């Protein structure tokens, strides 16, 4: 390799967070071959991309326009304000006209190597697709806004420019285990178990004999399993366990080149705190001056009412167990399962993992998919199948073959779960990692999110970082040195920031408020920073549209939070942006950002879910991104302020609460009674679409202090890294914004319970996709889940097998709950928090 190969090497593990290069922490080389085994799918999509889309990104949607948004459009009329350095004019457009084919039109009303760039944004409008289809066209039009964009030069190319290149029983001899330290206190027991598992089934159990443990304990112990060489599956893992649960380790008795694997090791276990992603990692324990290490050694036609019961089976929810019975039944009749795609991860589990003869016959299965790769993509079935239930590589990729179909709108929605997913993977290369990688170099967008998600997860992960550090390291050698750019320019200053974050914190006590001593000694650190090394524009992570110029210090401070988080203002580096407003971001450390992160992008999954039924339920969903750990960003939202802080104008710190001060704040913060209507408007559908996704997500109850509402009546909830009660916040303020005085029915209470179970109901309609979505956050984003109890508060929620009236009623119950209390449950959140 060359000097200046190194140095790039170097910026890669800057930009990555950990060092991909690196044998420390290895006992094989499947990393390497994983570094390598990507070089291929990188080369071939680095190359099938075409340089102009590449560099301008088009955010773009097949999907249909909506009737809300068509109520919008007055005469089939679309107007567009293009400017050029002091000068614009109004284009009247059609809303199929492409964007070359306005501006033939912009050119003829009045050089031909200008392109069309929202003002402000790295945005850009290019492409056969009409107007209507981009996603900033159709935001201008839901918020009312003016449609912007200036005449400038195409990006160049050159700019994304990527730099150049047996029949025998299985065995297992437990030799001991060792642990530097354990306190001189407790006279303690432990034991050995070992497990063949295989997409969590436990194939077969052997346990050691119990002896005491000290800081060496040595068995020299043969363990015979019953399951032979040959039917062991690949993928299986040899999951060792030391109970007294204290610490866990797995191996996988397959390795990447298809070799059993043989010979001698010694593995550093992972320590249990107090099922979870987290326990089927491949990955040891880097810490080796402190954790535990075992040492271990390897030497080797049906029937009208059978139809019935099949196609009942093949009816039920993710969550539903399957009898032996069941099993057995969808195993027999494996052909007619096959034409019923939604059976396919029940049939998939019927399979006797540990048995060769059947996993061949299940390949042979597999074979014949007519009626699978025929089928219309469904999501929740395609994450069904790439859980912590499957981890056969062919079951696996028939599910990521089905993702390919997705168009960029969608692979954006479903990225944070798709890269969660990767977690439950066997092997370091695989299907979902290529498509992943593959989406990500095709895509500037999709490229940017893949990186701060792989990013947020290797500095708070050891469990998978190693595997997230080479998918990322494959992404960023294929970017190219424009997107490497900016990346380096939002590394640095995230770090720059998240060290003043944490030494404020410090500074004063979570136990007391914010002193003119701590925000002066702000002000002096932030002064130091910005006339030095911190970068002169970044790209704001949660809206790489936007680039953040300059910071506002002047308007910088800490907030009088317990977590003490930093509201930092900066000025915008585009002087073609329309508009002289900051840029607001609050970064804090002391919360877990990624339970946040997953709240909001099943949030915009369900808004997604009411676009197809035509369903504006105006939810906020504000940008919060992950950067290490248990900090991040999040985005401030212009002229907006609390629930509680409405309530503590009229009273200050109580307890004391007034049912009419909502409906004061929003006639006071409206210059006309025209704008004030437009907010008690946006709040019907806010607070509806609200009260519908809190409790479907078992979030339902929370202190009207998370819970915020702009000056244009748009309420929505906020700091999700939390999780006599209440299903959701629907106190009397709220009510008396629509009418209601409590036990009395108003026109804008009908039309919140209208919106409420017609949200509702269009939920319902995707129960599978929201159960498959809440199990997964579950694995991959929480301490530690219950596999079986945890969950099934969502089945109960979205009332699972109930006709669409039962439920409605249930729900209908739910806000009369609410009702009832009042008041009662937000006091006791004041006591709660003295
Ligand atoms: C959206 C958002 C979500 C958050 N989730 C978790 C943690 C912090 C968050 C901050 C957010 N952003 C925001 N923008 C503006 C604000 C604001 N919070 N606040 C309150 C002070 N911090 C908590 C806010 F209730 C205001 O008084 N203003 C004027």
New binding site residues.
């Given amino acids: 390799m060359s000097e200046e190969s190194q140095a790039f090497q170097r910026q890669l593990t800057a930009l990555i967070g950990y060092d991909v290069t690196d044998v420390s922490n290895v006992h094989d080389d499947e990393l390497e071959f994983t570094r390598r085994g990507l070089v291929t799918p990188r080369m071939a999509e680095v190359a099938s991309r075409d340089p102009k889309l590449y560099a301008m990104h088009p955010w773009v949607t097949s999907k249909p326009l909506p009737e809300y948004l068509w109520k919008k459009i007055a005469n089939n009329c679309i107007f567009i304000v293009i400017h050029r350095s002091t000068t614009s004019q109004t284009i009247k457009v059609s809303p199929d006209d492409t964007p070359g084919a306005i501006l033939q039109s912009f050119f003829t009303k009045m050089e031909q190597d200008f392109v069309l760039r929202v003002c402000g944004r790295d945005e850009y409008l290019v492409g056969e697709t009409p107007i209507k289809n981009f996603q900033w066209v159709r935001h201008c039009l839901k918020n009312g806004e003016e449609i912007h964009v200036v005449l400038d030069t195409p990006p160049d190319p050159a700019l994304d420019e990527v730099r150049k290149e047996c029949d025998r029983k299985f065995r297992v001899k437990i030799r001991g285990i060792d642990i530097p330290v354990l306190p001189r206190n407790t006279d303690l027991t432990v034991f050995v178990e070992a497990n063949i598992q295989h997409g969590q089934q436990v194939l077969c159990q052997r346990r050691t004999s119990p002896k005491p443990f000290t800081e060496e304990v040595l068995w020299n112990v043969w363990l015979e399993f019953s399951i032979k060489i040959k039917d062991l599956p690949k993928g299986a893992l040899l999951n060792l366990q030391i109970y007294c649960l204290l610490y866990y380790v797995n191996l996988l008795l397959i390795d990447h080149r298809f070799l059993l694997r043989r010979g001698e090791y010694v593995l550093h276990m992972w320590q249990i705190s107090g099922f979870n992603a987290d326990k089927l990692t491949s990955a040891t324990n880097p810490d080796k001056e402190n954790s535990m290490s075992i040492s271990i050694l390897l030497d080797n036609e049906m029937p009208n009412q059978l139809r019935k019961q099949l196609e009942a089976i093949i009816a039920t929810d993710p969550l539903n167990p399957l009898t032996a019975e069941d099993k057995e039944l969808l195993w027999h009749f494996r052909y007619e399962s096959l034409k019923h795609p939604k059976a396919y991860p029940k049939l998939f589990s019927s399979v006797k993992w540990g048995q060769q003869e059947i996993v061949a016959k299940t390949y042979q299965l597999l074979a014949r998919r007519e009626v699978w790769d025929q089928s219309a993509l469904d999501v929740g079935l395609t994450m069904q199948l790439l859980d912590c239930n499957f981890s056969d590589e062919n079951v696996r990729a028939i599910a990521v073959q089905k993702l390919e179909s997705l168009e960029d709108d969608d692979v954006l929605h479903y990225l944070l779960q798709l890269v969660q997913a990767v977690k439950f993977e066997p092997y370091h290369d695989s299907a979902l990692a290529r498509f992943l990688l593959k989406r990500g170099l095709r895509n500037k967008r999709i490229g940017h999110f893949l990186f701060w998600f792989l990013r947020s997860e290797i500095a708070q992960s050891r469990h998978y970082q190693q595997r997230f550090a080479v998918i990322l390291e494959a992404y960023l050698r294929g970017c190219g040195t424009a997107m490497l750019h900016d990346f380096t320019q939002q590394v640095q200053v995230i770090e720059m920031l998240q060290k003043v974050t944490l030494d404020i914190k410090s500074l004063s006590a979570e136990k007391y408020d914010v002193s003119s001593q701590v925000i002066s000694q702000l002000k002096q650190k932030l002064e130091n920073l910005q006339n030095s090394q911190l970068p002169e524009s970044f790209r704001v992570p949660y809206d790489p549209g936007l680039k953040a110029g300059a910071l506002a210090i002047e308007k910088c401070k800490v ?1 009088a ?1 317990k977590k003490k ?1 930093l ?1 930092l203002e900066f000025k915008c580096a585009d002087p073609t942006a329309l508009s002289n407003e900051t840029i ?1 971001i ?1 970064f ?1 450390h002391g ?1 877990d ?1 990624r339970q ?1 992160m997953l709240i909001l992008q099943i949030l915009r999954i369900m808004e997604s879910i009411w676009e197809t039924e035509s369903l504006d339920l105006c939810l ?1 969903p ?1 940008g ?1 991104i992950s950067t290490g750990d248990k900090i991040g960003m ?5 002229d ?3 629930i ?2 409405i309530q503590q104008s009229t009273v200050g710190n109580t307890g004391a609460f007034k049912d009419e001060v909502l409906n004061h704040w929003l006639k006071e913060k409206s210059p006309t009674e025209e704008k004030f209507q437009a907010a008690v408007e946006r709040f019907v559908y806010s607070c509806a679409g609200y009260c519908v996704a809190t409790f479907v997500l078992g979030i339902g109850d929370r202190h009207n ?2 819970i ?1 509402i702009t000056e244009t009546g748009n309420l ?1 909830h ?4 939390h999780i006599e009660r209440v299903p959701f916040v629907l106190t009397p303020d709220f009510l008396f914004v629509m009418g209601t005085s409590g036990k009395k029915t108003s026109p804008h209470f009908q039309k919140f319970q209208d919106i409420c179970v017609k949200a509702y109901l269009a939920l319902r309609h995707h129960t599978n996709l929201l159960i498959i979505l809440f199990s997964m956050m579950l694995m991959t984003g929480m301490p530690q889940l219950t596999s079986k109890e945890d969950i099934e508060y969502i089945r109960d929620a979205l009332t699972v097998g109930k006709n669409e009236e039962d439920a409605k009623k249930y729900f209908l119950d739910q806000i009369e709950v609410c009702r009832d209390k009042g008041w009662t449950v937000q006091f006791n959140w004041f006591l709660h928090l003295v």
């Fill in positions: 907030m939070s988080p509201w607001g609050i804090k919360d950002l946040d906020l504000y919060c999040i985005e401030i939202v212009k907006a302020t609390t509680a802080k202090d998370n915020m929505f906020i700091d999700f890294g």
